[PDB]
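Key idea: predict the complex, not the pieces.
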Amino acid sequence: VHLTPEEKSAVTALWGKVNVDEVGGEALGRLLVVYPWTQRFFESFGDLSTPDAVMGNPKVKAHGKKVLGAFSDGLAHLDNLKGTFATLSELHCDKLHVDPENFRLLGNVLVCVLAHHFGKEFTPPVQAAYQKVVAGVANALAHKYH
Amino acid sequence: VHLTPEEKSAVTALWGKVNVDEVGGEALGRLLVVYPWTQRFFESFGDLSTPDAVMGNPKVKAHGKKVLGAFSDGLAHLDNLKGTFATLSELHCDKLHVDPENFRLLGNVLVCVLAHHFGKEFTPPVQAAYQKVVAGVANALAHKYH
Amino acid sequence: VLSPADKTNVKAAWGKVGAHAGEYGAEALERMFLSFPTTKTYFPHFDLSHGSAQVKGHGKKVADALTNAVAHVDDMPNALSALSDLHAHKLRVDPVNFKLLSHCLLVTLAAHLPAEFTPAVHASLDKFLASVSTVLTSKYR
Amino acid sequence: VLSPADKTNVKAAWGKVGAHAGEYGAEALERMFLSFPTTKTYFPHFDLSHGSAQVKGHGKKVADALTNAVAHVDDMPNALSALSDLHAHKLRVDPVNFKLLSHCLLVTLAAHLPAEFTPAVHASLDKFLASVSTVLTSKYR
Ligand code: HEM
Ligand code: HEM
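Result:
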C-alpha cells in the first residue's frame, strides 16, 4: 500500500502506543459481540453467549494477542503486504476456511477500538491512514484464496 | 488483471459476436431501469419515466454506444487496464462526479445482458472470466479517484 | 418493497422456470463457486465437482425455497422463518454472500429465459432476490 | 429488529451525546470524506476543507435527523419519510454509501464516549444505524 509520508508517520506514531495484547483482545472480543456470526470459527473457545462472557474469555484474549501480533509485523512491511501475508493467506483459505469478509469486519472494529482507546488523538486524518492500512491487510490476507 | 490464456481466449471469442452498439444501448438502458438512482446523471436525456421510455431513448442509446465502445477498445489492453483507463478515471472523478459504485453496477448488468444474449454459450467458466474483466475495468476506472 | 407489478412479474417468470427450478438452482451455485471463490469457504464439506450429487441436491433445495417464497410473496418472513434461523444461527453465512448468490441466480435466469427477461422483469427479479436476502439475514443479530 | 435492550442502549448513548450532536455529525462527515473519498462525488458543490461551515451546517442537519430517529425509535419509517424521499428520488445516493457514513458515525461516537462505548452499546448503535440506513434506502426502487 502507498501511504504519503504523513500517513505513514501517523500510523507508526500511534502504533508505538498500542498494547497489542490488550487491544488485540478487545478488538477480537468486539468482533464476536457486534457481528455474532463471526463466532462460527470459535466453537472450541468456550462461553461466548453474552458480551461479558466474550470479553472475559481467556481463549478470546489469547487469540486476539496472536492476531494483532501478526498484524503488528505487517506494519513493518507496508510496502509488501501481499508477500508478508502470503503464508497466512493460504492458511486461512486452505485450512481455516475463513471468509475474507471477516478480515474487513475486523479492520473496521479495530478502527472503532483505536478511536475508543485514543479518543481525540484518533483524528480524521489518522483514521483515514488506518483505513488504508486495514483495507490493505484484508486484501493481502485474501490474495491467496482460490 | 491476470487472466489465464484460456480465459483471455474465452473473453475474446465471445466478444467477436457482440454488436457493440446494440449491447451498449441495452446495458445502459437496463442500468437505468434496474437501479433508477443511476438516472441522476442523465436528466438532460429527456423522458426516462418508464422502462420503455428509457429503452427507446435515443440519448440513452447514444451514451450506451460511447461507453461500450470504450470498454471494447479496453479488451485489447487486458494486460494494462489501469494504464488504458487512467485519463478516463480522472475525468469521471474530477468532472463527472460519478460514484465508482456505478461501474460495478454496470459490470453486473453487462454480465446479465451477455447471458440473456448468448444463453447457453455464456457458460459458468465464461461468466467467471467476464466477472474478472468487469471487476478489472471497474477497478481501473476507480483507480484515480481522490 | 415489492410492488403489485413486481409480484406479477416474479410469478410469471418463476412459473416459466417450472420443473427446471432444480437444475437452475444447481447451475446458479456452480456459477457462484467459480465466479466468487471465497463462497467456497462455506462448503468445505461438499463435493463441489461439476455435476456432483451434492450440488445437484442442494440446488434443488435452494430452488424449492424460492418457489415457496414466490408462492408466499406476501408473507415472506413467515414463509422463510426456519431458513432465516438456519442461516443466522447455525450456518452463520456472512450477509455479503447473499448478493453474490442473487447475482448468480439472476444470470442463470437471464441465460434460460430469452423471451421473458425484459428490462422490467429483470428489475422485479432483482428486487425479489434482494427481498429474499433481507428476510434470510434479518435474525442475525 | 431493535430489542428493548438495544433501544435503551441507544437512548442512553444518544442522551449522552446531548448538545454535542451537531459537532459530532460534522466530524462524522469529515471522517467519511477523508476515509472514503468516493463519497465526495455527492458534494461537488461543497467546500470540504477542514472547518468548512457548509460541512458543519450539514452535520447539524444529519445529527438532528438522528435525534428525531431516536425519539421515534418505534416509528422510524414515518419519522424519516421525507428524508427517504429525498435521498431516493432527488439526491439518488447509491445505497453502498450508507454503511460508510454509519461506520464514521460509530467511530465518532467511540472517540467521544470513553465510558458509554461498551461492547454491548457498540453492538446496539451498529444495529440502530443499519436500521436507519434501511429506512432511508427503502424507496429507491
Ligand atoms: C437466496 C438466498 C439463499 C437461499 C434461498 C438458501 C436456501 C438454502 C436451503 C433451502 C438450504 C437447505 C436447508 C436444509 O437442508 O434444511 C440451505 C443450506 C445452506 N446454505 Fe443457503 N440459501 C441462500 C443463501 C446462502 C448463501 C449466500 C450461502 C453461502 C455463500 C449459503 C450457504 C448455505 C450452507 C453452507 C448451507 C448448508 C448446506 C449443507 O450443509 O447441506 N446459503 N440454504
Ligand atoms: C445516516 C444516514 C443519513 C442521514 C440521517 C442523512 C440526513 C440528511 C439530511 C437531514 C439532509 C438535509 C435534507 C434537507 O435539505 O432537508 C441530507 C441531505 C443530503 N444527503 Fe444525507 N443523510 C444520510 C446519508 C447520506 C449519505 C450516505 C450520503 C452520501 C454519501 C448523503 C448525501 C446527501 C446529500 C448530497 C444531501 C444534500 C446536501 C445539499 O446539497 O444540501 N446522505 N441528508
